[PDB]
Structure formats: structure tokens, C-alpha cells
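Dear colleagues,

For the upcoming journal club I promised to circulate an example of a predicted protein-ligand complex. I picked one with zinc ion because it came up in last month's discussion. The inputs are reproduced below in full, followed by the predicted structure.
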Amino acid sequence: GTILIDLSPDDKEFQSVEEEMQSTVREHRDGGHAGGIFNRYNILKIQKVCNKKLWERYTHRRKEVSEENHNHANERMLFHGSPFVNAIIHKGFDERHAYIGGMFGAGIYFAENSSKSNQYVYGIGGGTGCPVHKDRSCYICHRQLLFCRVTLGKSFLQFSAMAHSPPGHHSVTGRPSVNGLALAEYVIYRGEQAYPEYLITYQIMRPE
Ligand SMILES: O=c1[nH]c2sccc2c2ccccc12
Ligand SMILES: [Zn+2]
């Protein structure tokens, strides 16, 4: 039921999605090990993901969270990188996209920093890098990230350096407490609390 609509680079929606992608790049404490060395991306394509059933699944759950949290969905747009982005756009998020070894438990992880999600495109810790060259820092191969609408609801705040949400909460917020430049990361425990709105195809760019 999924169709992908290609956005024109002249569309304001293309532009605002690209800007969120580029502006949320940061340096990482692994010196680029997982995700490569780059300060910015070459955005190749931005597609709107359209699936009525997956959307209504999202909005149904959003209303439930909202009504449990004084009419506040606490909805964000967050990045998600994963080897399984193609399963995700067709079938939605579910238990199989949970990070079992994650620091906030076995849920589905999202990032404010596009560059954080980039580290997961080829697997946990970047896996063995790109299929074709085995290069975690490949500048040639095309990568994809999802920019997702996520319902956080009442989020459990965890300061720091499929399971269930903490009792009385709808998500976990991993608040960075050491690296002053890191943005927040988030975990939901229900696949229906995220909708993969944009598929972004890109390459990381070698600095000069
Ligand atoms: O964007 C992310 N994708 C994936 S896939 C398995 C774990 C994660 C992950 C963890 C922390 C922050 C972002 C992400
Ligand atoms: Zn490659």
C-alpha cells in the first residue's frame, strides 16, 4: 500500500527537510568509526512516504497517547537509520526494528542528530560499512535515512553519558550529559508511535 512521491528540490518541503538533515550533523566521539568522516551530506533524493493504513495506525495511537497526557501527543520529527528502511516504509515499524542491546532497553530508537542516525544505516556500530566496498566511511555508495513523525507522550527523562515503557510513560528521552554538543535521542516501545514520513537518499561528503 506504500507509494513514494518524489519531492522537487524547489519544493519548500524538500528544502526544510534537507535543512534539518544538514543542520543536525555533529562530530561523534568515535572519530567517524561507525558512520564515517563528514561535515555534511550530498542529498540525492527526498521522497514522501504515503501509506493510508500505516498513517491511520499512527494517528489512532497518537490520539490514545494524547488523551492519556492532557491532550498532548508531544510529537516530534526525528531521524531513524537502519538496514531495514525498506521493510519499514512498506510494513511500518514493529518489534523487529527494536534495538535489543540499546542503553534504554529493547525499543525503537530515534535521533535529533541526523549524523547519529547515520551511524546505524549499515547496522549497529555501522556494521561492516557499505555492501559494495565494506567501508563505513564510503563516499560513493547511496545511503538512506528516515525522517519520522514520532509520538513521545509523557517521556521518561534519562540523563546519561520489545520491552515496555516505564510505568506511567510513553517513551524514554536519552538526554546527553557529557558531550555538550550531542542532541537528544528517544525510544518508543510501540511501533504505532512512529510514522516514516520521508525517505532521504544521500551520500556523506568527504571534507577538504
Ligand atoms: O537512528 C537510529 N537507528 C537505529 S537502528 C538500531 C539502533 C538505532 C539508533 C540508536 C540510537 C539513535 C539513533 C538510532
Ligand atoms: Zn561503498
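Two points we might discuss: The first strand starts at residue 3 and ends at 6. Helices lie at 12-23, 52-67, 85-91, 114-118.

See you all on Thursday,
B. R.
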